[PDB]
Design a protein around this motif. Structure first.
Motif, short mmCIF file in Angstrom:
data_model
loop_
_atom_site.label_atom_id
_atom_site.label_comp_id
_atom_site.label_asym_id
_atom_site.label_seq_id
_atom_site.Cartn_x
_atom_site.Cartn_y
_atom_site.Cartn_z
N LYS A 165 0.91 13.69 5.07
CA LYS A 165 2.00 14.21 4.25
C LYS A 165 1.76 15.67 3.86
O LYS A 165 2.65 16.51 4.05
CB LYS A 165 2.18 13.35 3.01
CG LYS A 165 3.31 13.81 2.12
CD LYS A 165 3.72 12.75 1.11
CE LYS A 165 2.63 12.50 0.09
NZ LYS A 165 3.14 11.68 -1.04
N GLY A 174 -6.44 1.71 -2.45
CA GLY A 174 -6.39 2.89 -1.60
C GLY A 174 -7.03 4.11 -2.24
O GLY A 174 -7.72 4.88 -1.57
N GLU A 205 -1.37 11.26 -5.21
CA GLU A 205 -0.30 10.37 -4.79
C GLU A 205 0.05 9.37 -5.88
O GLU A 205 1.21 8.96 -6.02
CB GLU A 205 -0.68 9.67 -3.48
CG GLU A 205 0.34 8.68 -2.93
CD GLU A 205 1.78 9.20 -2.96
OE1 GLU A 205 2.69 8.38 -3.21
OE2 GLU A 205 2.02 10.39 -2.66
N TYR A 206 -0.94 9.00 -6.70
CA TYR A 206 -0.77 7.99 -7.74
C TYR A 206 -1.23 8.57 -9.07
O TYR A 206 -2.42 8.52 -9.41
CB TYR A 206 -1.55 6.72 -7.39
CG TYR A 206 -1.33 5.56 -8.33
CD1 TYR A 206 -0.13 4.85 -8.31
CD2 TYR A 206 -2.32 5.16 -9.21
CE1 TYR A 206 0.07 3.78 -9.16
CE2 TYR A 206 -2.13 4.09 -10.06
CZ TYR A 206 -0.94 3.40 -10.03
OH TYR A 206 -0.75 2.34 -10.89
N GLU A 216 0.85 -1.18 0.00
CA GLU A 216 0.00 0.00 0.00
C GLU A 216 0.89 1.24 0.00
O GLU A 216 1.96 1.24 0.61
CB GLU A 216 -0.91 -0.02 1.23
CG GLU A 216 -1.83 1.18 1.43
CD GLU A 216 -2.45 1.67 0.14
OE1 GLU A 216 -2.23 2.84 -0.22
OE2 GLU A 216 -3.17 0.88 -0.52
N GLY A 274 6.53 13.09 -4.52
CA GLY A 274 6.13 12.21 -5.60
C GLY A 274 5.48 10.93 -5.07
O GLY A 274 4.79 10.93 -4.06
N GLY A 275 5.72 9.84 -5.80
CA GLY A 275 5.22 8.55 -5.34
C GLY A 275 5.96 8.06 -4.11
O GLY A 275 5.37 7.39 -3.25
N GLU A 287 -6.78 15.90 -5.59
CA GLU A 287 -5.91 15.61 -4.45
C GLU A 287 -6.10 14.20 -3.91
O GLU A 287 -5.25 13.72 -3.15
CB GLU A 287 -6.07 16.60 -3.29
CG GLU A 287 -5.63 18.04 -3.51
CD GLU A 287 -5.91 18.92 -2.32
OE1 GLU A 287 -6.61 18.47 -1.39
OE2 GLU A 287 -5.42 20.07 -2.30
#
Ligand SMILES: Nc1nc2c(ncn2[C@@H]2O[C@@H]3COP(=O)(O)O[C@H]3[C@H]2O)c(=O)[nH]1
Ligand SMILES: Nc1nc2c(ncn2[C@@H]2O[C@@H]3COP(=O)(O)O[C@H]3[C@H]2O)c(=O)[nH]1
Ligand SMILES: Nc1nc2c(ncn2[C@@H]2O[C@@H]3COP(=O)(O)O[C@H]3[C@H]2O)c(=O)[nH]1
Ligand SMILES: Nc1nc2c(ncn2[C@@H]2O[C@@H]3COP(=O)(O)O[C@H]3[C@H]2O)c(=O)[nH]1
Ligand SMILES: *[C@@H]1O[C@H](CO)[C@@H](O)[C@H](O)[C@H]1NC(C)=O
Ligand SMILES: *[C@@H]1O[C@H](CO)[C@@H](O)[C@H](O)[C@H]1NC(C)=O
Ligand SMILES: *[C@@H]1O[C@H](CO)[C@@H](O)[C@H](O)[C@H]1NC(C)=O
Lengths: 438, 445, 443, 444
Positions: A413, D324, D425-426, A351, A391-392, D421
């Motif tokens: 974050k 997720g 992240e991905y 995850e 980033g990732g 948003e």
């Protein structure tokens, strides 16, 4: 005997207000009683007079040697100096009532005989009775039991006043004249208290009044009794609603969310997980939400409450040695409190991760895919590398689950980035800390 | 040519001078109708008071024909339009019905004078809004309403007794020929005693005999249980409103105590926070000012902000040469915080992003060692006006230059750097004026 | 035909069917216990009971062919409605209440349609104009049903024990004073009121079952009195809750103004404003009163409240519908006290005001002169909001603007005005050309 | 073996041990006061008291082996449990409620009443457990009223026995008479006097001696305080029961008074009142954020994937893009309720909302002509091209249809930034949804 008094630290001055309370309550009870009953007999005036003398000496000691010593604030700074404090007492409105109450009409005994009506001016220490109420209500850890005791004290005192007034009216009509008045055959105070209870509680069963004075008396007594009983119901209902307020609100939100889940036909496992979350939240915090509690307090007391609970856990982190106090303080003002049920995941192996987990009264285990690698007791921290990298970044390297009822502290974050952009030099040294980590 | 302004105090004086005769008309008209000994025995007094009440009624018609009413925001003042606005309403119909001029033994024909209840209700509502004892007036109004009901029921019971016949049954009034049950004071006091013992569910009356008496007593007991229910409800609401703020504050104290016993804070911080909150309660400022002034309009908020903070923000000599626009903007955007003794305002080496204007407090600057009082400041002082301009070229670099601690219970004004930048991003000339005055004071220091 | 469950026909049907349910409750317990009504008005009770049963079978037909919502749509398949009614419990209750048990105690199954009366009471509570008056009427109706049922229960217990053997029971009914039906019912109602309203002026019990019945009755009466006090306290504290909240707000404002030591002319100004508020009923505020309705409904409400005053100004009509919707939702209203100055000279032009229920006028520098007195429908605040280099002015005002009466404005700040001129600056530029024409003309 | 305090074996044990505590209270004050009930059914009361004492032995043996929470997990060490039970005052109470004093004086067994915390814990567990909390609070207060009534009936009979039967006019009458002599009459008339004194009704004989005056004064004071607590708590609980509907109707007539003052036309007024009637009729008065703000994000996501993932899993490329991110989308979606005939979107309007249809039926209509292009049931989606707005397109920045409501639909909106948003992240999920929006937008 100190040089000055501590308004919130003096057990000694709390017992002193207890003594002035006992003197003032002696006067409020027994001045009607001596005034209307034949209890000041010839072999009793000396005992009643030494009681009133020690009462008035307690009064004068309160006016002289204690009340010019109580601390106070003027312009924010506390006041210690004795002459300025005494001037503050002299130019206060408490001294007005006290010098109006210590007016000695006892010298009028030689002019009109013995009559305790002359000492009716000693009932003006109600301000020093209410300061005692406020101090005991603020110091006791259970205010509701003292509120019930104070309500019952007011009820017993109103009933004693009404028994005294009924016996005065019985003497003014003549004892045993009509069928309403007190007939004399028993204990005077006991039967008169019985009359005052069965009238002012609005109960009924007493003899019917005959003379017009008796009918006017009984009418006003029943009307004031309806109002006293209504005040009693309202007072006890307010004590109930102020003693069970957070419990009723918590139960109301718990029942409204179980009503929502039963309205949407939520499965039994999810409903049991939600209700065991609510039961552990009630057995942990005695409260539903603590962020909503914190958002009401001022900013610096929010900061102090956050630091006193989290600064040792931050400063024991070997990675946060380089960072600085201002943004550490802001990020400790901006943490989230969560609770994870036993057997639930906080990070899956694979995850993606965007949070930092401080654990606090919890026990999590890291799994490297069911075998537990390590465990972490309260105070430990994990989940750092996927917080600060942009980033990732990196995914979570292992499954970590809560063994017991873990109560983690999370820092997201983007919230960390929003704190960081107000602090560029520490953001730069944190990037260099990332580079010396990797 | 006069126009009575219905928001002034002359209108309230007229509401008092007309709420006495309406209340008199209700009370003593039902009494004079049902008793028939006041009306026969005090005839000169009742004729004088009736003529005076009708004179006050016709002057109330004349006054209510000359009260202005707010249209288009202004108070209209032309008598023809005020007469038309009066005539198009139904209140004028009720008033002209109440002013109908009707052998001087039945005041049963004078019951139309009761139809001005609107004046009494207006007087009670204006007094409840206007006076400074709202809970005492609410209890006085409730006592007056249930006293009117008890009096009306006493007159009704005496009228039912006179209809049935005196001394015929055991429930009705005794025989009035016997001269002890025949005094008028005795009549009214025993009727009031019966109606209170019925209408407040006491139940000490003699039991009824006939069907009509059984029915009147059961209807009267149901009205009485409803009156007792409203009495208990009003007194409970008055008790719950008399200390609602204090109960909210004790709930907040108990919530803070529960949170602190949960998170295991130190005892010194716990007693500091508790004495802090009790001082904030005793100084009567515990509620946050934005939550106080949320319901106010922006112009009233601006006038309050001027009247509070400009008295202190004109005592500054460094921020003096700017404009009233920035003055009003800063007094709108000042936000207050109250501190505790021994609290660090700004430590040495911190990012200065706030500016502080001391107002009713006393502070101190110290070193890194602890309690060495270098300079004690007072009301009207200021600090933070050099690390929020962010001037490049000097040795500091927006860094706090002093350890600032409070020695008493201070009360500052946080003025943040982002708030000042939002205040000044539409004023480049004021920006560079503050930049040059900060540069001069920093080259001085 | 499919009956709409939210229409007016359904509520009128609930009235026509909650009349005989109330009849069945009230007069069925009275006719079962009293035994004189049922003997005297035999054909009358037979006619009214046959009519109530006809209304019950028409009720089960109407609850059969009524609709129920599926996927946000009212279905109309009558067999689907019949299946939806056949699977639920109310059809079970209705067919249980229609057992044809044609002395008057055999008809007690007709009381099972109580949810219909309850639905009528709740629909009237939702639908009427006077909710608190209807609540107090419903509460008096409930305690009158309870008083009547306890009166019939006392009379039945008295008949079972025997008439006049004791002193608690009803007297010997062969005596012609205590034998009439009027006095029977009124004395049983009076005994029941005296027991249930917790008074106890009645004769005391003699037998053991009488003592137990009076104990049970007094505990029922305590709970009924407590429920009455609770319901009237809830009503009397929810009828003036707005007044109590406004009083707490006024008291907090007074506390703040007394603490910060502000001056008495501003004090009287604030209190005259609050007296104007309480005498003209503008108590609730906009942002909190318009948060609990859906977004398209509040857009429609904004349309309907401000287009009637935005179409009165002629020069502002040349505007696009989407821009009109967004600005009419972003308009913020404020109410200005008289004499207060909206925009002074030299101040930065922040906002754009639309006159609705107000009479503003322009004045000179600290001088009350009337260059032009504005009225309803007008507009100002236009040349300092588009960020134009004007006639040596920039982002400033031209003259002072007063407030004569209790005006009301439509505020539009520069922030929401940039959020306006992010959609079609071409149309805003047409408005800017005419505004620049006015500006070059007057300055 | 350790029992869990939050389990159901512990609650069945709580019922099987809150039976004899209630027996001990009620029937032990009755057996100690009436004294014919004890010396009549002696074998029955001896069997029941021996059973109560054996149940108390098992009560001590269970509380010496129940578990408790320490550092999150269930502590099950038997020695630590023995010490943790030993250190508390409940162990001293459970030892004092076990000493076997007991013939003809059953007052010596009043030490078995010291285990009141068990009955209170049973009442508290049932209150927080059952689905009728207000009726259980009524039942709890009615049981407390009955216990106090029974105890003052027993105390009135004991005071009558101590003074002398049939002596005064206030005491119980002469006991040698067969009408007042039976135990049924004894207990029932004592209960009658107890309720007519503790209710403050007073249709009872008035006292004569001074000790009777003092007992009747104390009894009416206890009566008025208990009945004041009862009236207050029942009024508070009725207010708590009706508060939700009261504030709902407050909001209703507030918005009514607003629109009536601001002169809104009758059709829009009636549509708003009909919307509130529909809202109350289908029970959507509560708000999702206002009900689940307090719950953490994990349980919010569990309820979200239980409610909306079954409806979302039927669209084209959303077959587990990432778990997720689907969790984040089903958390960050937001509900809405529409009226029939209400336009979701006009022509020439910026789009900032993705709507998902769930328990609703919308329609795509033309501008001038009311026509049915395509109907959309639950699980369908629209808004994607206007939320995406990728460079190189037609780029109208407008919604290219008229999605109109057929009935009382119910969508679940999703804003463009709450999309962005979430996916920040991905970005590969963004890339895939961008290509699908691109292909549908460019084939039109
Ligand atoms: N893989 C791993 N992570 C550990 C271990 N002990 C502590 N941790 C932390 O647990 C983590 C969980 O996921 P992270 O990617 O956040 O990174 C990992 C580490 O910071 C361990 O033994 N293995
Ligand atoms: N360091 C310092 N600050 C002073 C002194 N006298 C007044 N001040 C002000 O006190 C301040 C408090 O912190 P600031 O950084 O805001 O800036 C400092 C100065 O403006 C002094 O002697 N030293
Ligand atoms: N000066 C001026 N402004 C006017 C007049 N009529 C309407 N207005 C508007 O009133 C204004 C008030 O301040 P603005 O800067 O907003 O700009 C001005 C104009 O747009 C007029 O006759 N003179
Ligand atoms: N124009 C259009 N939109 C469609 C169609 N089928 C589904 N949709 C969605 O419906 C939409 C409604 O307006 P949008 O601009 O939001 O974008 C459109 C598409 O995402 C179709 O056939 N035409
Ligand atoms: C009242 O008293 C008079 C005087 O004797 C008598 O004639 C009359 O009958 C009495 N009325 C009743 C009802 O007793
Ligand atoms: C009632 O009265 C009648 C005659 O008055 C008598 O015959 C009968 O026995 C009485 N009944 C009772 C129960 O007393
Ligand atoms: C009780 O009754 C018995 C016989 O009935 C008698 O002998 C005794 O004196 C009575 N006692 C009292 C106190 O009445």
């Amino acid at each position: 005997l100190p040089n000055s008094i501590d308004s919130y630290t003096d057990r000694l001055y709390l017992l002193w207000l207890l003594l002035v309370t006992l003197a003032y309550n002696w006067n409020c009870c027994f001045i009607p009683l001596r005034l209307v009953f034949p209890y000041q007999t010839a072999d009793n005036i000396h005992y009643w007079l030494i009681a009133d003398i020690i009462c008035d000496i307690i009064y004068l000691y309160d006016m002289l040697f204690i009340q010019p010593r109580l601390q106070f604030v003027r312009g924010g700074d506390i006041i210690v100096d004795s002459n300025e404090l005494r001037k503050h007492y002299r130019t206060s409105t408490k001294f007005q009532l006290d010098v109006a109450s210590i007016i000695p009409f006892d010298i009028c005994y030689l002019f009109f005989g013995f009559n305790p009506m002359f000492r009716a001016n000693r009932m003006l220490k109600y301000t020093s009775f209410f300061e005692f109420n406020h101090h005991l209500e603020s110091i006791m850890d259970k205010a509701y039991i003292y509120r019930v005791i104070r309500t019952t004290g007011y009820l017993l005192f109103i009933l004693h006043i009404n028994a005294c007034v009924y016996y005065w009216a019985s003497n003014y009509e003549g004892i045993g004249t009509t069928r309403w008045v007190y007939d004399g055959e028993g204990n005077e105070y006991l039967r008169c208290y019985y009359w005052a209870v069965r009238t002012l509680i609005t109960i009924g069963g007493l003899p019917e009044p005959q003379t017009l004075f008796e009918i006017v008396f009984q009418l006003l007594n029943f009307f004031s009794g309806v109002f006293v009983f209504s005040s009693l119901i309202g007072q006890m209902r307010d004590v109930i609603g102020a003693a069970t307020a957070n419990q009723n609100y918590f139960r109301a939100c718990m029942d409204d969310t179980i009503a929502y889940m039963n309205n949407y036909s939520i499965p039994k496992l999810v409903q049991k997980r939600v209700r065991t979350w609510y039961e552990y939240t009630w057995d942990s915090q005695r409260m539903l939400d603590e962020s909503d509690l914190l958002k009401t307090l001022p900013t610096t007391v929010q900061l102090a409450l956050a630091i006193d609970v989290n600064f040792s856990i931050i400063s024991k982190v070997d990675l946060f040695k380089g960072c600085d106090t201002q943004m550490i303080y802001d990020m400790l003002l901006r943490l989230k409190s969560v609770l994870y049920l036993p057997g639930d995941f906080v990070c899956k192996k694979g995850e993606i991760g965007k949070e930092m987990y401080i654990i606090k009264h919890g026990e999590v285990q890291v799994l490297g895919g069911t075998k537990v690698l390590v465990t972490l007791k309260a105070g430990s921290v994990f989940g750092e590398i996927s917080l600060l990298a942009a980033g990732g970044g990196n995914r979570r390297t292992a499954n970590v689950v809560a063994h017991g009822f873990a109560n983690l502290l999370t820092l997201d974050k983007k919230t960390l980035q929003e704190i960081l952009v107000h602090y560029p030099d520490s953001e730069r040294i944190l990037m260099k800390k990332a580079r010396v980590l990797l | 040519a006069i126009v009575v302004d219905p928001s002034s105090n002359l209108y309230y004086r007229w509401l008092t001078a007309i709420a006495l005769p309406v209340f008199y008309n209700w009370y003593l008209l039902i009494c004079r109708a049902c008793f028939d000994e006041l009306q026969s025995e005090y005839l000169m007094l009742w004729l004088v008071l009736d003529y005076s009440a009708d004179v006050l009624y016709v002057l109330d018609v004349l006054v209510r024909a000359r009260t202005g009413f707010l249209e288009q925001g202004l108070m209209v003042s032309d008598t023809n339009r005020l007469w038309q606005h009066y005539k198009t309403t139904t209140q004028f119909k009720l008033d002209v019905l109440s002013l109908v001029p009707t052998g001087t033994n039945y005041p049963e024909v004078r019951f139309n004078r009761l139809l001005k209840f609107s004046r009494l209700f207006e007087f009670f509502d204006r007094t409840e809004t206007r006076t400074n004892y709202p809970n005492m007036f609410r209890i006085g109004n409730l006592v007056l309403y249930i006293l009117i009901i008890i009096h009306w029921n006493a007159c009704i019971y005496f009228a039912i007794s006179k209809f049935i016949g005196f001394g015929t049954d055991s429930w009705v009034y005794p025989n009035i020929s016997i001269p002890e049950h025949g005094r008028l004071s005795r009549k009214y006091i025993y009727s009031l005693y019966w109606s209170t013992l019925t209408l407040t569910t006491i139940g000490e009356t003699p039991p009824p005999v006939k069907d009509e008496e059984y029915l009147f007593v059961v209807v009267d007991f149901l009205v009485g249980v409803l009156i007792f229910a409203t009495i208990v409800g009003n007194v409970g609401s008055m008790i719950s409103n008399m200390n609602a703020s204090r109960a909210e504050f004790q709930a907040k104290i108990d919530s803070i105590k529960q949170y602190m016993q949960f998170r295991k804070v130190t005892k010194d911080l716990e007693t500091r926070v508790i004495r802090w909150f009790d001082y904030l309660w005793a100084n009567k400022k515990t509620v946050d000012e934005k939550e106080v002034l949320k319901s106010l309009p922006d112009k009233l908020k601006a006038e309050i902000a001027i009247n509070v903070h400009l008295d202190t923000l004109k005592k500054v000599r460094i921020f003096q040469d700017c404009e009233a626009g920035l003055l009003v903007e800063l007094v709108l955007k000042l936000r207050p915080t109250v501190f505790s003794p021994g609290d660090y305002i700004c430590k040495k080496g911190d990012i200065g992003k706030e500016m502080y204007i001391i107002n009713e407090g006393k502070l101190a600057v110290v070193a890194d060692d602890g309690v060495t009082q270098f300079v004690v400041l007072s009301d009207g002082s200021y600090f933070g006006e050099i690390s929020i301009l962010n001037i490049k070229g000097s040795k500091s670099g927006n860094r706090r230059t002093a350890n600032i601690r409070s020695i008493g219970y201070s009360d500052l004004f946080c003025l943040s750097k982002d708030d000042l930048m939002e205040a000044l991003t539409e004023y480049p000339e004021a920006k560079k004026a503050l930049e040059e005055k900060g540069r001069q004071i920093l080259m001085k220091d």
